[PDB]
Amino acid sequence: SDKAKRSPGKKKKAVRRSTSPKKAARPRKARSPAKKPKATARKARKKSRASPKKAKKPKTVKAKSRKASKAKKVKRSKPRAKSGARKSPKKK
DNA sequence: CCAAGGGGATTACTCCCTAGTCTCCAGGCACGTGTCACATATATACATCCTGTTCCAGTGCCGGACCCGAGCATCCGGATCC
Numbered sequence: 540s541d542k543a544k545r546s547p548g549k550k551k552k553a554v555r556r557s558t559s560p561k562k563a564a565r566p567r568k569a570r571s572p573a574k575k576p577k578a579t580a581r582k583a584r585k586k587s588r589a590s591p592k593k594a595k596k597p598k599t600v601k602a603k604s605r606k607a608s609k610a611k612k613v614k615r616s617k618p619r620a621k622s623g624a625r626k627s628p629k630k631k
Numbered sequence: 632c633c634a635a636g637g638g639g640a641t642t643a644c645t646c647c648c649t650a651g652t653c654t655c656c657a658g659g660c661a662c663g664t665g666t667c668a669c670a671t672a673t674a675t676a677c678a679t680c681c682t683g684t685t686c687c688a689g690t691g692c693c694g695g696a697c698c699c700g701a702g703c704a705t706c707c708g709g710a711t712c713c
Contacts, residue, residue: 555708563710579710590712614701 542626549628556620 547553554560564578572587582597583589602610 553708560709574711577709577711583710588712589710591710594710 541629545627547627556623559620 546557560578563580564574564576566581566584567574567578570584572584580598582594
């Protein structure tokens with residue numbers, strides 16, 4: 540009895556906690572794209588058509604533009620997910 | 632080969648008798664050094680005084696060992712691109 544949920548279960552394809560990606564897919568459904576079960580960052584709502592080597596530098600620019608308080612909140616928040624990632628698998 | 636006694640001899644202290652020479656034998660002199668004298672100088676037993684360093688405390692500091700945590704890198708977990 541370390542964790543009774545184990546809903547992903549891995550096998551080569553899963554979703555991280557199935558909730559934060561769901562929390563990101565909710566704006567997908569609410570806004571114009573209304574995508575099938577795929578979930579990503581915010582900038583895709585502005586431009587659904589994106590590509591790697593190009594859809595990441597604006598995130599770094601935004602991080603530079605924002606403040607140290609926001610950066611610290613970012614470092615602090617998801618450590619909850621760091622703690623929770625060991626519950627269901629129970630190990631590595 | 633020496634100790635005792637055989638006779639025979641010049642010396643050297645000893646008598647005789649005089650006399651002139653260092654030495655006892657005492658009333659007086661003004662000296663010589665062994666003792667005396669007040670303190671010296673000499674060697675010794677106490678009380679532990681007071682100083683300034685030089686004999687030491689408290690903590691008037693915080694030196695090493697072991698487990699964590701900051702941000703930029705690469706693996707991996709995830710968007711979705713032909």
